[PDB]
């Protein structure tokens, strides 16, 4: 895993990372690791800006789990 690509990914030019930005990331990755090392990786994957439309759902997941993991529901919220 790596935030190496952040150097270009953090341009935030759309949540979906575009070709160009990704090639700059690729370049930088090859600068950091022997390209042959990298050529044994099945694929290099570039993650997108986590979209607000996603986050708007993620927080429900998190809030549910946050509460459920607090031992027993002797307190917690109704979580409305």
């Amino acid at each position: 895993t790596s935030n190496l690509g952040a150097e270009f990914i953090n341009s935030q030019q759309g949540s979906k990372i575009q070709e160009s930005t990704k090639n700059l990331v690729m370049g930088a990755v090859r600068q950091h690791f022997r390209p042959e090392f990298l050529n044994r990786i099945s694929s290099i994957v570039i993650f997108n800006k986590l979209s607000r439309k996603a986050i708007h759902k993620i927080v429900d997941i998190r809030l549910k789990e946050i509460e459920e993991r607090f031992e027993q529901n002797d307190k917690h919220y109704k979580l409305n």
């Binding site: 090859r30 600068q31 390209p35 042959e36």
Partner: protein
């Protein structure tokens, strides 16, 4: 020379086109294998063409033949 020549013929057949390149290399390698080239000097070549042209593979095939192993190839990124 004969081990090389039999392999040069396979090299010419395996590489798409680039026969002229193969022959240039073959000639120099034979000169060197014979001991006629001054032994102090390793053979060396400048592979001039298109990126994506197979120049690397030619060299790998040369390794694949002259040293009987394509994976013995040692590589240098000169742009970084």
């Amino acid at each position: 020379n004969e081990k090389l020549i039999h392999m040069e013929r396979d090299l010419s057949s395996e590489v798409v086109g680039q026969m002229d390149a193969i022959k240039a290399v073959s000639n120099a390698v034979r000169l060197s294998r014979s001991g006629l080239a001054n032994p102090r000097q390793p053979a060396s070549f400048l592979f001039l063409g298109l990126s994506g042209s197979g120049k690397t593979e030619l060299a790998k095939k040369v390794a694949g033949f002259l040293f009987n192993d394509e994976d013995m190839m040692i590589r240098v990124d000169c742009s970084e």
